[PDB]
């Protein structure tokens, strides 16, 4: 009926290597993806680090520029790729997606994962 975001509880990636934080859903007829955001939990408050909208991709903090991508081309796959993982990258990440509904308004879903960085 309404789309369901799929994000695992935790992801573990190699220090100074790369990792994929999955965020996927089964696309439904009549649901149009209008926004994707990835946020990171710095403090008690999430801050946006990636935004995809009608004008494309926007990387919102300077330390991610050239490190952060959402590159899968499969519809419904908005997984986050972070290259050269740092200790500082250990945090909780939110994947948030906004769709237009068949009825003309919008619905939004989000899900939190914990990123662990392994030596």
């Amino acid at each position, epitope marked *: 009926g309404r789309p369901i975001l799929e994000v695992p509880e935790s992801v573990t990636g190699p220090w100074k290597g790369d990792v994929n934080l999955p965020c996927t859903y089964d696309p439904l007829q009549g649901y149009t993806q209008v926004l994707v955001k990835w946020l990171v939990q710095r403090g008690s408050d999430p801050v946006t680090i990636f935004l995809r909208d009608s004008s494309g991709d926007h990387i919102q903090q300077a330390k991610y520029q050239g490190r952060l991508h959402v590159s899968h081309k499969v519809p419904g796959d908005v997984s986050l790729q972070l290259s050269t993982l740092e200790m500082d990258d250990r945090s*909780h990440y939110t994947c948030e997606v906004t769709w237009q509904t068949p009825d003309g308004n919008q619905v939004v879903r*989000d899900k*939190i994962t914990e990123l662990r960085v392994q030596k």
Partner: nanobody
Amino acid sequence: QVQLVESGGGLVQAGGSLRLSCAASGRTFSSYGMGWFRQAPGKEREFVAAIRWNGGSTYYADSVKGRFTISRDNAKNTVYLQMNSLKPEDTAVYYCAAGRWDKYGSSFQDEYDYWGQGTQVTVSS
């Protein structure tokens, strides 16, 4: 992976107050939006209240808005449901629930992965 246990249910009189608690196992409690649902005799389970992982943003069913307040203490792995101005139609089994939603969908059972067994609240006339 998360086990939930509700406590503090019981028999209370109409007009009274009752405070429920739900304790979570694990060391990821900060990662979870927490919710209360309830189910009365013969009726389907319905949303009551939810609270974001950081505390602060809270969400309520119109039926209990204002009368009930949800809170959490992340240091203690506990969510609370302060039920004020109780009415007999509040009688139900109350379930604690946990999901990894951040800001959205908190009113929907399907957004929650883990459930307690529930605790009985009875408000007498």
